[PDB]
């Protein structure tokens, strides 16, 4: 008897009375307000304990925002014999759910934005509290994240490959911040890159100083130090990435 009357969910048991209280309907938990019989949605207080329901009234388990920030709405019996879905004390530690990472502070709220934990700087997405992954622009600075940690190196963004550099490489950049790096080679950890006028690493076939190079489309690293098959054709590249004339 689930019907959406005026944008509000009620459940009639087949009774002039719409159900109230905790209801499990088709393996999903709902709470119908005892005054109005409406299915709770969003952050909800029930008997002085805190729960979270999605817009359909389905009780959620995980990390969701209430008026005091992101709380861990935990499986039953995670802390202090909590009932299923109830927000719990969870202090000064990481939380791992599925493939997501959170960090919880002294207030049992998940960190959002930039935070330092054991001398490492992390970024957790303000919208979800989930560890940042992939390319990100924050306060006009470009970063490339993995598991909440800014990565250092050359990675593909929406405008091509950027140099996400160690701190203080250019214009007092922050660790992992993309930097201006124009019309120059970058030699980084046994790999070679060439950066054009827009500070992006070039890819594919290039002629630089009269020498030919091929920069791998997936990494922007020069083919170097051996024979490489490119588009069904074997070429030979010097240790410096310079292509030797001929086919092999």
């Amino acid at each position, epitope marked *: 008897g689930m019907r959406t009357i005026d944008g509000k969910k009620y459940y009639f048991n087949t009774t002039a009375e719409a159900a109230t209280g905790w209801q499990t309907i088709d393996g999903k938990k709902y709470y119908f307000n005892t005054n109005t019989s409406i299915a709770s949605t969003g952050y909800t207080i029930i008997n002085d304990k805190h729960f979270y329901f999605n817009t359909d009234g389905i009780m959620q388990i*995980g990390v969701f925002k209430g008026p005091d920030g992101f709380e861990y709405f935990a499986p039953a*019996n995670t802390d202090a014999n909590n009932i299923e879905g109830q927000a719990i004390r969870y202090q000064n*530690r*990481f939380l*791992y759910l*599925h*493939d997501n990472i959170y960090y919880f502070g002294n207030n049992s709220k998940a960190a959002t934005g930039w935070v330092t934990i054991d001398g490492r700087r992390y970024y957790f997405e303000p919208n979800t509290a989930i560890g940042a992954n992939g390319y990100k622009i924050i306060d006009n600075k470009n970063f490339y994240f993995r598991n909440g940690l800014p990565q250092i190196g050359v990675f593909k963004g929406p405008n091509g490959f950027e140099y996400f550099a160690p701190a203080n490489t250019d214009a007092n950049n922050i660790d992992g911040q993309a930097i201006r790096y124009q019309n120059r080679f970058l030699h980084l950890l046994g790999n070679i890159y060439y950066f054009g006028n827009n500070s992006k690493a070039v890819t594919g076939w290039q002629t630089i100083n009269g020498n030919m190079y091929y920069f791998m489309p997936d990494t922007a690293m020069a083919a170097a130090g051996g024979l490489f098959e490119i588009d069904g054709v074997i070429y030979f590249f010097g240790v410096d990435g310079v292509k030797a004339p001929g086919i092999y």
Partner: nanobody, 123 residues
Framework: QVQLVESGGGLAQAGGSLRLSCAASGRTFSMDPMAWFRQPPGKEREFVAAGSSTGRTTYYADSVKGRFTISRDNAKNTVYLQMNSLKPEDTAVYYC????????????????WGQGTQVTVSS
């Protein structure tokens, strides 16, 4: 109330294989990473393997890398350690653990620990 119970341990011979199970009860672990540690004779407990609930993130200690694989059955609240190419040096008390709270899963910072089970690899 919460308990992790290892089973499937005991004797095996070098080059052979064994699968350990760890069944969790008292709460659902279907979102939590689960892991294995081992305490070799006369040595400190050490990390073996850990993995997320989806299996998409897994780590292995250098000593078991390419011989042991971790897997789960979430409906059964259970984690497995498939041990292949067993060596005498794999002899140890094997512990499962769940819901790590440290900066990485190699660190022995886990909300829940099993009872440990003996694995003895001979010859």
């Amino acid at each position: 109330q919460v308990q992790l119970v290892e089973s499937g341990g005991g004797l095996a011979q070098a080059g052979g294989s064994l699968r350990l199970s760890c069944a969790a009860s008292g709460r659902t672990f279907s979102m939590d990473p689960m892991a294995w540690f081992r305490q070799p004779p006369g040595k400190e407990r050490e990390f073996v393997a850990a993995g997320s609930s989806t299996g998409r993130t897994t780590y292995y200690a250098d000593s078991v890398k390419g011989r042991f694989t971790i897997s789960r059955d979430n409906a059964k609240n259970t984690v497995y350690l498939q041990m292949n190419s067993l060596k005498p040096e794999d002899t140890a008390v094997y512990y499962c653990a769940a819901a790590p709270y440290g900066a990485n899963w190699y660190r022995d910072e886990y909300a829940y620990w099993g009872q440990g089970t003996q694995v003895t690899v001979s010859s």
